[PDB]
Amino acid sequence: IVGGYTCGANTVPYQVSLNSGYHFCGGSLINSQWVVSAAHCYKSGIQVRLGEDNINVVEGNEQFISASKSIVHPSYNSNTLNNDIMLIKLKSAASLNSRVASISLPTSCASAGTQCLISGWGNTKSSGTSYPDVLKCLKAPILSDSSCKSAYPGQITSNMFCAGYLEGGKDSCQGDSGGPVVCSGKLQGIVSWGSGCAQKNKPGVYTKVCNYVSWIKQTIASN
Numbered sequence: 001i002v003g004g005y006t007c008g009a010n011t012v013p014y015q016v017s018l019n020s021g022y023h024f025c026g027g028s029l030i031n032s033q034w035v036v037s038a039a040h041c042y043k044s045g046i047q048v049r050l051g052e053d054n055i056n057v058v059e060g061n062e063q064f065i066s067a068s069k070s071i072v073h074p075s076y077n078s079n080t081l082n083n084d085i086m087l088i089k090l091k092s093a094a095s096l097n098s099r100v101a102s103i104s105l106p107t108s109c110a111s112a113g114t115q116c117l118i119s120g121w122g123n124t125k126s127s128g129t130s131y132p133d134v135l136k137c138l139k140a141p142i143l144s145d146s147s148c149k150s151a152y153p154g155q156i157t158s159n160m161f162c163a164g165y166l167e168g169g170k171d172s173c174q175g176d177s178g179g180p181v182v183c184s185g186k187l188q189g190i191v192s193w194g195s196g197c198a199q200k201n202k203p204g205v206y207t208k209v210c211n212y213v214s215w216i217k218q219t220i221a222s223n
């Protein structure tokens with residue numbers, strides 16, 4: 001997250017870190033057994049880390065649970081990042097508590113202009129590299145479809161939305177991928193892609209979760 005703030009320990013209790021020996025992507029806990037992330041975050045050998053604040057210090061509220069299964073969307077296209085969504089099933093259910101909690105899936109798509117909370121352990125620099133240890137947060141508004149298409153011509157599908165600030169300076173970034181965009185208390189986006197981070201006229205692009213709720217529900221009913 002570039003231009004964000006330190007969230008505060010466990011104040012984003014559905015944020016998970018995906019670890020393969022190191023943190024490599026975020027995700028969102030949607031119930032005691034399942035995490036939503038980006039398909040471009042797929043790796044074999046994922047351990048889900050819930051209850052994290054500092055990802056480099058064991059502080060006492062973590063749960064570390066191996067994935068048993070990952071399920072990339074059936075139409076994921078890694079060239080365009082259309083359908084950039086994945087489900088990860090935990091080998092055992094998380095213990096839900098005040099610091100480890102699920103986030104609701106949406107019933108309706110979010111409104112352009114809505115300010116949403118984006119969070120992660122990604123790079124905090126637009127030019128250069130600095131990865132924080134503690135969770136960072138950003139409030140960013142959803143941009144109109146026509147602004148998002150103007151920013152990335154020929155690349156935005158109906159399964160993507162932009163959010164952020166066209167003047168630059170505030171964005172998600174590498175290492176935030178897979179994590180949540182929460183708007184009015186629902187998971188509406190997944191950190192997906194963008195040109196650089198926090199660059200003028202190049203806002204973040206997010207997977208539009210409200211288009212996937214029937215897939216998510218039938219997949220978790222079947223696995």
Ligand SMILES: [Ca+2]
Pocket residue numbers: 052053054055056057058059062
């Ligand atoms: Ca920790």
